[PDB]
Design a protein around this ligand. Structure first.
Ligand code: HEM
Length: 154
């Protein structure tokens, strides 16, 4: 796939709003993912035990991980499609160490779009949401292709 420049602009314009509060968005997004798809919490041997949303909100470790995830995702989006380098180490650890199925990257893509929609309705109308979905599908497609080369296509 190839996004046009206008689509990238819509993606980087709402992302600049996320970046005003990286740790708060990270929390929202991971909690929305775990609530929606509790099976994904099992992949975290660190958080696994968190039983409620209140516990999740209070977990300092969870919030740090959220900042890690978003920082890496933001560095990938800012490349505007030229992200091969950034993807390599990410696809190797998720395919060999963590073992995250493509299906779970779709689930978090959904949680990212839900949260931007709630927190930025004015910078996240239909065209901007289509552009963000297109940028995340691109991301999932390049990752999936690297999974296959690494031997996982999981
Ligand atoms: C936008 C998608 C994602 C990005 C950009 C991302 C990024 C990262 C980064 C940068 C790290 C630390 C470095 C590393 O281990 O590679 C990480 C660790 C991890 N990620 Fe991903 N991740 C994403 C999605 C997921 C999803 C969907 C899950 C599972 C449901 C997941 C599970 C984990 C786990 C198990 C770790 C290790 C956490 C800890 O033990 O420290 N990741 N991820």
């Amino acid at each position: 796939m190839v996004l046009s420049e206008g689509e990238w602009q819509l993606v980087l314009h709402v992302w600049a709003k996320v970046e005003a509060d990286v740790a708060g968005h990270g929390q929202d997004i991971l909690i929305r993912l775990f609530k929606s798809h509790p099976e994904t919490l099992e992949k975290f041997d660190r958080f696994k035990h968190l039983k409620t949303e209140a516990e999740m909100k209070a977990s300092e470790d969870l919030k740090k991980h959220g900042v890690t995830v978003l920082t890496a995702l933001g560095a990938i989006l800012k490349k505007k499609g030229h992200h091969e380098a950034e993807l390599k180490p990410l696809a190797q650890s998720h395919a060999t160490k963590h073992k995250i199925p493509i299906k779970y990257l779709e689930f978090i893509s959904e949680a990212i779009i839900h949260v931007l929609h709630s927190r930025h309705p004015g910078n996240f109308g239909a065209d901007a949401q289509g552009a963000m979905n297109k940028a995340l599908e691109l991301f999932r497609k390049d990752i999936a292709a690297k999974y296959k080369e690494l031997g996982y296509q999981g």
